[PDB]
């Protein structure tokens, strides 16, 4: 940086120390990722200088010839990447994704099925403080108790039950594949539309280590930042019957202007993820998560579902008489963040838990392998097994320094 | 840039595009700024890869020590600049800071009382394909039919017939100040809510050129990219009293994740607007937008409400029998950016118009200053008189690059 540090020392100061942060700590946070110098740069450019409300060469305001240009490579990118009929890249999160979807098909008060929050479905698919929950009526499947992966028959019970006009299927804290095709075959059965939230698995889904919900779902929305890699935001996929409508619910609908910049630099990460290296990437991730769990159980945990087929997983921590907070905390104590995190038919409450969550896609980007995860997994146990002995603590903190150089 | 040329030569080339066409062209859009060096630097930072959901020390997730100084910087300064008790800097435009605000206050089909969208209201304050008049029962006071000028009586009348639960004020193309007072006297006199939408004018109240809103009402939104000429995105200024209330609108209520990136760039332009440079460009903005009315008047062009307060006018094109949309395209041919806008009583629809929109905060942030707000005016002169002549517009083109060197 250049100009910043002579204008405005104390936010440069507060930037270089997070910057420092994100090199020494060990990212366990499974949302968290590190984008490129490249995705970055495009967030820092002139483009922030530009209005651009409506769409490409359907714009309300002049001078879009470029941004233009820039809003259409983030969209046909996303549609070669997913194979997608049509992409909106305007959302200005994960939220306005989800909002814009449910503006499109739902009235107030209609009714929708979505994921148990506290079995691993998102906030905004219906959480009661949430806009979601307040503005439509929410109902819920759960997971198998035993096994923890989603009951498809709970599914379908309540889809007959409560006769929702839609149906969501993903999820915040899901560490196994997700059956697209069995969503669709009930959301079928009751007339339903069915969105699918990918957000978590989006990058994983590009290079072709979960199945896509494109070819399911009516809607597909996602954050632009997990998987993916990319700036922080949101897109939304769909068929081209459904292109005006959504467009129109993102604008004039729900949002204004769009964050040109924002897009320029989705369209970079778009760029990166249609490259091989990325596919490579990504498949670490995956047996990284993998590797990661099978160390966690040679220590002794417990995982929710008993694994992960994608880049998280759950700890749950009853075995060992812990909760989520009090292991958050003390992981944090050296060096290695985490998140408390409710497991399915937690007895505790979501501000409390009996589980952390754990993804590997922020510590692969950083190159982290099979050996460093069974580090991880080491350093875990000595740490959780030990939560009295300032020794340990210290013994930890200094194998994490060790990983992070 | 370093990165993005060689790792994306499509988008680097779009954006280089972009960046010649900002320097080229005699920016008039009300609404557009530059920002700063430190600003879009601010806005490329390592911040975009935080998660931090949650307020400044009550973070739903771990890590956040440095990027809670960074929010509580925009914070602070927002406060200091507006006298304002609270901010909340994290909403991710002006639509979900408005967003937020109904969320508070209003439950699914409450009336709410907003400026006419074709005298100058917005979007938000109640369009039927916008959420706003979808979401909640919008009704509209106008200006007088003459002066251009709001009618406070009829604000009165609005409100004690209707019995809105808010009343908005607040414009995107209202050349005049705002009679803040008059709409809390209103608003106590129903029991109503007073919301001001500042996004247009929120730079000249930081610098004490038009009356502050926030001693008046109960909430203040605004945008960070006007004449704040700061990053784009929203913030809500409240007293105490709705603290609470307003951060869980936002969160968990209408967003997620905040852009933490985002919020640095507002921290850098409210540190930026605290300084006494920040002030006289404020200063010139307006004494810019007074100049250019007074010469336009000078070239013959009739301004609605007969020349400006602020930074913008509106010139009604129906004395030159030209639509806006006619002006709009034809300036575009000589590099000159404006917006073809409703006016007061438009016999035309908002897609053709009367009249064209023009603001000066751009071109002073360039520099502009008495003499090139004179020479703007007889050039548009110039090509508005003349319309068929490729002579002219050629001339135009030319004085244009004069301009913009």
């Known amino acids: 940086m250049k ?21 020494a700590k060990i990212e366990l946070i499974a949302s968290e990722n590190f984008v490129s110098r490249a995705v970055m740069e495009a967030q820092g450019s002139v483009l922030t200088n530009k209005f651009a409300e409506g769409y490409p060469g359907r714009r309300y305001y002049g001078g879009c010839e470029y941004v233009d240009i820039v809003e259409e490579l983030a969209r046909e990118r996303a549609k070669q990447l997913f194979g997608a009929e049509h992409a909106n890249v305007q959302p200005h999160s994960g939220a306005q994704a989800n909002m814009a979807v ?93 969105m699918v939230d990918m957000a978590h698995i989006a990058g994983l889904v590009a290079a072709g280590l979960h199945p896509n919900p494109v070819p399911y779902a009516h809607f597909v929305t996602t954050t632009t930042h997990k998987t993916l890699r990319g700036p922080r935001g949101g897109m939304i996929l769909c068929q081209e019957q459904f292109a005006k409508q959504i467009d129109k619910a993102i604008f004039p609908g729900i949002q204004g202007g769009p964050l040109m910049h924002v897009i320029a630099a989705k369209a970079v990460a778009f760029g990166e993820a249609l490259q091989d290296d990325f ?56 060096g290695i963040t985490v ?37 991880i997994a080491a350093i875990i146990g000595l740490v959780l097994k030990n939560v009295g002995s300032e020794q340990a603590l210290e013994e930890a903190r200094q194998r994490v320094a060790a990983l992070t150089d």
Chains 1, 2 share one sequence.
């Open 279 to 334: 596919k490579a990437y990504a498949k670490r991730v995956v047996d990284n998560a993998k590797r990661l769990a099978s160390a966690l159980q040679n220590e002794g945990f417990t995982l929710v579902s008993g694994g992960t087929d994608n880049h998280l997983l759950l700890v749950d921590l009853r075995p060992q008489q812990l909760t989520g907070k009090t292991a958050e905390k003390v992981l944090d104590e050296v």
């Open 102 to 194: 449910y503006f499109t098909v739902l009235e107030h008060g209609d009714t929708v099925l979505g994921m148990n929050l506290s079995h691993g479905g998102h906030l905004t698919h219906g959480s009661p403080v949430n806009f979601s929950g307040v503005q439509y009526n929410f109902v819920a499947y759960g997971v198998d108790p035993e096994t923890h992966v989603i009951d498809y028959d709970d599914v379908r019970e309540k889809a007959r039950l409560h006769r929702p006009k839609l149906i969501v299927a993903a999820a915040s804290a899901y560490p196994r594949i997700i059956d697209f095709a069995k969503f669709r075959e009930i959301a079928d059965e009751v007339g339903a539309y069915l």
């Open 339 to 375: 998140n408390k995190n409710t497991i399915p038919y937690d007895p505790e409450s979501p501000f409390v838990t009996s589980g952390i969550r754990i993804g590997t896609a922020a510590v692969t980007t950083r190159g982290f392998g099979l050996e460093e995860m069974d580090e």
């Open 3 to 23: 100009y910043l540090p002579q204008q405005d020392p104390q936010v440069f100061a507060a930037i270089e120390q997070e910057r420092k942060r994100q090199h």
